[model samples]
Target chain A: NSDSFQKKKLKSFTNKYVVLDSLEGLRSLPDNSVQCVVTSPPYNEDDYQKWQLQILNEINRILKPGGSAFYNHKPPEKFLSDSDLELYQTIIWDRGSTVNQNARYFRPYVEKIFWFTKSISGESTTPKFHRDRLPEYFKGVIWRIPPDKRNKHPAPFPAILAEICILTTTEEGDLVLDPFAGSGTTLVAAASLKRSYLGFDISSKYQKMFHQRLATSKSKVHLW
Target chain B: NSDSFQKKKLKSFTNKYVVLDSLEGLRSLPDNSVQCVVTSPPYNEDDYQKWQLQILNEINRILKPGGSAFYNHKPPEKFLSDSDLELYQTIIWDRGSTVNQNARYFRPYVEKIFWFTKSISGESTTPKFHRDRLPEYFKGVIWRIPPDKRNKHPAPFPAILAEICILTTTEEGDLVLDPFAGSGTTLVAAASLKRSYLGFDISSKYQKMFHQRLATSKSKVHLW
Candidate 1:
């Protein structure tokens, strides 16, 4: 049964995350191995398009039929163009963030999350959103949760953001993946809800910090 | 000699608006003539890209050295994609609008406004944005004004949305144009602020409705 492998992964998934120096390490995962994904792609250089081309198509290739990926990206700096994958919908994170207000432009307090779905091609199956699992207020756009005050990672995801995406798109025993692990917030969120978690990051310092954070934490993600 | 024609168009601009049957009429205007352009571009048909390809480049070609174009369009159905126009910045209108939620998706309530500037050839110019004219509340990215109830046209322009763009970009006598003006809302907003406005629509029914709406109102846009 499909549930058997997911259960096995959840049982042994305590400290199985890895840090990859190169982006190609994601290719090691088997196809259709993950049920949910949530990650913030990087924006430091000229090769951002190459990064999306490498990972996003891989995400579609790796997802189960009903699996969903909640990809976090911001505008002006890093816009996840719809050329590669047609996102199911876009979620605007409107609770707000400030990139030092003294800059010479409008104060941007929001980012974007594009929900991408993958299904078996040539077969017409309804992709699952699990909208029934979402509360009435959480079902709408304009997610009001603010950014986490993570001093370690360049962009640490808010736990509530990860929790909502996981709860709405996945089951308790499903597997969640975060390709850009950063502060390991998505891993903490998935495990908090009894789902198996896998994560990848390029920085060893953040990996070390993640290990430390996991050591001092509860079995589940605790709220601020 | 520089501000000469602009002042002429502005001084004689009382009750001077012409509605047209096709988009090709925009070509009649001189190059670099408009100071600001704002309209909610429609998304109902197959030619959304064609619409942008037609008027967007024309907008860039017809804008003055520091003039700007505030192009409003929505996503999933029609998104004003960041194409050939080198948009300086974008403003997200957060006032919610629903396309009737009960389908297999989350309801989208926000629309996007891309800010484009003009200058020919290899040279670059700083487009003017009169941020000081705005109150402290509108200096952020999220514009929380709700959608206007368009009882006449298929899509009506939200007055506050048009006003914010006009006030932020133009002097009082600058000429503003709406190439797809459905209900004449952009023209009304322009006239309210003492800026000149011209609008065009192919549908004579909407053209007739615009005349009615314009005839009945003077100071502000009436809400439903």
Candidate 2:
């Protein structure tokens, strides 16, 4: 039924959004700026750590004190430790299963959302957390949200995943940033959660898809 | 029905296996001693890293070249990097859900089995992995096995988890070591998989429980 609904809904959005400037554009932002950032940056590049480190330092430079950034990745490898931001908790996004085949290791069915916080000094600081947003049962280190297939993006996380990050780490009207906002999943969720958002991506097609997704959708996060 | 099976099974084993030394006991082991090591060590104690580092180094010192030690924990924290061994891979054990209530963060329903390998020199060494032991579909980073409830231990992993680790990492008759073998889950799994096992625990009650669980069990791993 939702397929039919979306099919009908898809017909209404002919209007859109491009990409060329990415990390270079990010450096232009001021320090201690945003409240929260949720992103899964490009990792398939040859020098992933080099590019990742740049974005990470940029994200840290732009985050307000005690503000958090939710970085989604396959593993918390060496690059994570290289950042100035303090390492916080890791939230496991357990997508039920995956079709990716592996002969040497177990197929990956999970991604890690590393919570990094901007600390003022060497002292420990508590980041903003609004647990009252969701029911107590849903609050856990492991989140069992399935993959989102409704979008055209090759890899897209469920809007609920973005909603959870936005709702838990920030308040309404807080600014959210997604450095690699593929298909605009985070931006859509930020808007749905009543938070302002900024996004950056390198693919023009993905940039266009985000605008289409945002325009066609309703505020489904209210159901949570 | 398995409860009745296990209850009948439980009654048959009043017969069992003490502890005084733990990490100190491990130091006596020879270099390149074991084929594999599977353990969930004590993390609740004060200055956990101090004790964990000692055990990790000992495990690394004793493991055979290209051998592995599956260190199970909630998160791959700083202590992991402090070890002499190289981090090979991370396998997620998704224990469906948990009742451990949390007000600050999500209730943890998963644990990480960090596959650390003993490498010679700084060169990357290939660790032993037998994918033929399992169905191709089950060979993924995330393993979805529910918790085992038949035991009286406060925290006990299912024996099947241990079986997967052993079956994939080592061959029959290979030696397995569990330095903090609380409930003997790893030892029993090693036995079921026809690998030799050595375990160490601090509690005499838990030592007795290991024998109790081991003696009453059949080769349920064959069910895989």
Candidate 3:
């Protein structure tokens, strides 16, 4: 059954991993191929022109019923409507304090993660996930930036942030997809958290970075 | 001139606004008052406990030199720091996005505001007064929820996330202040932005919220 679902013609990070040339390549996979879709799409206003809605619609079609999708976006109001998706909750990555006056009325010092669950039946029982219940004031964690220190990619989601996402979103051995795999933060996070991931990125440099980081990730935990 | 500045405050909608007593009532005010300081003093933890190091030693004394600070905190980490004065910043409110597996992390979102310097030198500049350079992304107007609409004030900051601070730190007018201000989001941001503001908060309801927010705001518009 696992082999039947194997992705074709793509590079594998390990036995369960695979890479594709383009989004068009993903079409070859069977429907409902993804369990949970989690990724930080590009935020540059210009990038929205290219993929924003297109990628969202694609994810909407492939996600399994009862499955959830988490996107790290800014002002979700721009792309999604209150009717299109239920605004589940938001996570704040309190990156120390700095005032952002680069905005018209307020400086943006925080990013938003929008969560939506695909309704499987008329009644869905999966409990809604919220960070408020955590003992910590926020769903807080410390991300260990690699020794390289200098970031090659302009915007990289913290690995720790992604790791927590994988742990909370899927069960062990579940398949995860990061279509916009910048520097492979998701893949590395997934591996560290014990989930299998399939990732894609437009930049070759980032693909290589993901590959290198995954190869070196510490994966001793049992996730069964 | 007062009307012009007043008009600016009226032109926007905000998510977090705080009302404090008189400016002198705030323990955090002094020479070099505050440029920017971010800290997560408390939230999920205890209400009465104030974190040590919440206020940097001599910060109020030398802050006139123009400096910035950022702080990261959690409930457990609250005991690790302490301060004698109030702190403030605009919070980036997130509706929800992360998988809130534990109720601890279930809060819908988090927020912080940038603290900035209004006058680099003792001499103020004219360009700073003109709002021409205000970024389009800032949202300054806040909807006043009538008493009937007021939800449980588990934690509430006025909608105008630190706009007053932006005005104070970068420009000038009557020093603004928020006393009995739940979250001193208004006081600190106002002081850092250019306007002088006094704020006060007696309840633990806003103690942690205000201090933590000030530690993480990243507003640099006035600094440059």
Candidate 4:
């Protein structure tokens, strides 16, 4: 029921993919910098909620007025205030089953993919959603993609969900960022969808993973 | 830019599947009551946003400890999942059936159901989280039931969606609620599972529609 992450240490593979010491990497980016900010916010013992809020706030500040932030994170009981951002939708990632359970309540296998619109003036001033970019099969609110656990990092985001987020949000060459890039899933997904990718992580281990993955041609956008 | 919920206004059924004229109906219930709340908030030009928050706030208030509120809606463009209730799981209701889109149209046929808990302890201390009781088909994230286009009411909660929400969340005799009960889909779902139901609506036109739906219904749960 208690834990903390204070080291605040990090690396990135150029602008292509980076591993940051902490969230400081996000500050280096320009305002209205990215088209889509997609990433899985990390978890901390005492501050998981406010932690993600910071990242989301940064996502909001850096996102273009018409941009969207797809937050892939699980939270505690109480979260942020109502006016924090323009939350567009809550996408459910139904993973089916929690790996291990000790019979507290129900075994949950679902994660929330919170979609937010970062419009500065107000919601009405937001850009029109490019529904034209989303594939029809993806139109349903329930996505049943199974989780592909990759441990090169503790939790490597599978490409399917990342790609769908990209496909439904961006046009070709739009910049997509992952401020908490763990194993490079977002960038890879962005690259495959014809969008430019930028990832920031706080682990050199994953930074090396990104380079190796790129060396082996694991992702489309990482061809350096 | 100016939105209003002034047109909306509520009471309850015979302690089961009741229909009232407004969200005020929720106030009639005792504090920390009800087991599960399953409903879709209506579209408020500007009023719907804060309006649902009020209802959800009440849902959070009235729900017994451990009870969960299942909010079925599109991505909220301007609200926070961070309400008084502790946000739990984001369940993706994969309708299982993706609609065909024009070549120029790309949309994923999905909706987000946000799950939140009602508790005052600031965290869960074992209310009721039931997952093992779910039927085999419901054990997964994608519900492949074809959408039931019931024109009995302007918009109806498909019995399957309602039933799944009921089945996965509560036990028999537990009271379930649909604050924006339209066409009695949630009530009908309650009946199928042998759970008690309460619904609140603003229009008598749909109130009568609920009686009509019950009378001429072709559902197993509505036989009562």
Candidate 5:
């Protein structure tokens, strides 16, 4: 695969790239090793048939105790109910886009980030892991940027938004893994917030773009 | 004076209410007694001259170590510097009202709550109060609402908002005192959260309204 070639070219770093010819290859990994897994799986009905159940079982097996998985997809009702996972919270990433779906309501400018933990008992034993307090009323400014000042990246989240997640979810020096690694936004966020990051994408073209962008990024902070 | 009359009426409820005719009257209270002080002081230049600095100083005196004060007013630059107070956070109370002022940005909102605590040796020694995590990116939602959702009073705060503050700031059975108990919103919130409440308002009309509201409020669970 492309990973094997990239590993040969980049000798300094050890790359653990599993070239999966089949779903069974993914099943071979040791359980409870990954600290956190954030991925945007493929959407649409046909795409779900390929990796929905397999990915869910893999994530459940690999995720460490108390570790969280943030899935970016409209989870099926049956899948949500069948899993012993507790829905911690959902974040709506409003991107100001609109789409007209014939059968559904007009889809507007919002995506859900479902946070679930793989706790067997399905109980929130940790009391501190609750949502933050917001004031009775909030006004002044909703989006803190002028339209022109907003990021050009297709799915970039505001830096402040990512900072909130990093500050709340993971402590310093913890590894943050974003498997989909779309434009490496999460990696950039993790780096900025002093967290080590591991990211992967299937496309080599996007992988090269991510590396160049990361290297060119001037706002470098010490990642613990 | 109205101060003594109000204090006499409040004495039966085992709650202390002080009405100071002048700044010097505040000196009578012992240092470091109150756990929290929530007040909506009169705003603007005229009101600042009359009460802001004096009230802040008195609040600083009576506030116990690690106690928090939530003050609702405009930017208190002079008072903050003079009292040696540090503004920890700001919560904007957007009532969603129309603005009619002549100034370019006519102030749409009337109040902003400034959270502060007493400075120890010219440094902030306030306890790091943990806030609930917001699942949403920009704004957080209030999850629990009182079973009886009735805003009978003219300007009563949403019960859900009050419950959040009560649960976060204080524990069950902790005595919560609201000095400006307009409609006894704080008292109801405290009582709902199973905490003893003492409230005081300068107007007897408001005092009677508060008593009536609390009497009719149905206790759901853990309200001793």
Candidate 6:
């Protein structure tokens, strides 16, 4: 009966999404609510560590057993350090090359996607990984996808990046979450792959833009 | 008089190197002895953090003011954590792709070169960086270099990788150090670029192999 109820519940939400602060949106969800989380938070903050830890702790709590969070950031140590989530693996997003070339440092042409997972203490729970879901060419540590052309958000990753993470970690009809949705590319990507998503962003402008993008996205059209 | 002595001291060493343990060789060198260090240690050790911290502390002690150490490793945070060296910049060595493709994780095709500098407390010391030394195309955070073919050691980075680190940091006759010399690629790269080198490795077989490689290396002969 519970199995039947779960199966029925999975198909109930088509496009039930929200727009709020990342913490508030995460607080509204019950524990073990989502199957996968494919999101990137803004890295340019004063207390990135504090902010990141809080959001990641929430993500860890909200993720179901065997669920995953594909966190896109530049880099970090200790798998978010004090967080209980176990770092499964890392994926390097090589955006071909970079425009931020300078003498002070090398051109940063790549970002890191830390695949973190939640497991019971001392009990190793295998993550929901579907290696067969990814094509042979797409199955590697370095994903050499070029960055999206200028968009509504200043730093929105390509939809294919989101699609890759979602398809590998989730099945159709599974719910996805984006704590810091920004331009809502993750939501659009999840929906395109026929998965439900709940997204959070502080900007009302992006809320309108996300809905417009989602509307046009179904018609097989490019907005920007 | 000391300036002239220093200039003479700079030219005093040629192939006068040693073969011993990494810690032993590092201990033999005086403080502020080397200009640049370009080496990759075996990362599969049980006490990697302990071993790394020990060796890196020695590197920091021996590096001259404004001197640089181009540490070739996968990744780290807090600039070697507790070491006094400040992280100047990071250069990503994209070793093309990988043959180690699997279902567990993405194929790791790249390594990280952390540019660390020994700065004084509360005083920001500028690292000896030469932007003009690098060609326009080479001026970036991401360096796209393929892995070297199988060599004496199981895993040896390309000579060009060592050369990139050497040329961008030091001048002619400046001493370079490679504590874990392995097949002595760093030593050879340094010598080829006209910079002096001090190398250490535990294996006598590799010591002989390094010398043989260095000998035939002069006549434009490629050693396997």
Query: Model 6 segments beyond 4 Å from truth?
Result: A1-14, A43-47, A135-137, A219-224, B1-14, B43-47, B74-79, B122-124, B135-137, B219-224
lDDT of 3 by residue, B91-181 (tens): 3433233444446334433333323223343333222222344343333321112121232344444424345234423435334434344
**lDDT tens digits, residues B27-67, model 4?**
66776657888888776455766776787777887788888
Listed per model in order, the count of residue pairs whose N, CA or C atoms clash below 3 Å is 1, 7, 115, 40, 5, 6
**DockQ numbers for every candidate?**
0.41, 0.36, 0.09, 0.22, 0.01, 0.47
User: At residue B109, what lDDT does model 1 achieve?
Assistant: 75
Q: How well does candidate 5 match the true structure, expressed as C-alpha RMSD?
A: 20.4
lDDT of 3 by residue, A1-224 (tens): 43444343223433233445435545444456666667877646545534566566656555666456778774244345323333344444444433554433333344556665554333333523434322343354322122223547777767655655666667777667777777876776677666777776667777777667667767643222
CA RMSD for every model?
4.6, 10.3, 14.8, 8.5, 20.4, 4.6
What candidate 5 gets wrong by more than 4 Å, as runs, is A1-141, A144-224, B1-29, B43-47, B96-111, B133-156, B219-224
Order of models, best TM-score first:
6, 1, 2, 4, 3, 5
Q: Which ten residues in a row have the lowest lDDT in candidate 2 chain B?
A: B9-18
lDDT of 1 by residue, B1-224 (tens): 43575456434533445556335646656677789988767653547566676677777766888888887765422334334445766677776657667535666777778887785684556778766666667777787787667555556657877888887788988888888888778888888888888887776777677678778877573321
Give the per-residue lDDT of model 5 (tens digit) for A1-224: 54554334223211222223223433443455555656666436645654566666666665667767766663143354345555554444434444432211112244555666666555552312312321212122121221113455455444444443444456666656565665665676677766666665565655666677678876453222
DockQ top scorer:
6
Number of the predicted model whose lDDT against the real structure is largest: 6
**Cα lDDT of model 2 by residue, B55-126, tens digit:** 888788778897989888853555577677888878888787888766566677778888888866655677
Model 1, A1-224: lDDT tens per residue? Answer: 44565455434543356777325545666567778889887764446666676687778767888678888875422334433344677788875658657433567787878887774663434456766666666667777776777546766778878988887778887888888888888888888888878888887877888788778768665433
Q: What CAPRI class is candidate 1?
A: acceptable
- lDDT computed for candidate 4: 0.67
Residue B60, model 2: Cα distance from true site in angstroms = 3.4
* Candidate 2 residue pairs in backbone clash: A106-B139, A106-B140, A106-B141, A107-B139, A107-B140, A140-B106, A140-B107
Model 2 lDDT, residue A5, Cα? 48
The better-scoring model by DockQ among 1 and 6 is 6
Residue B3 error for model 6, in Å? 16
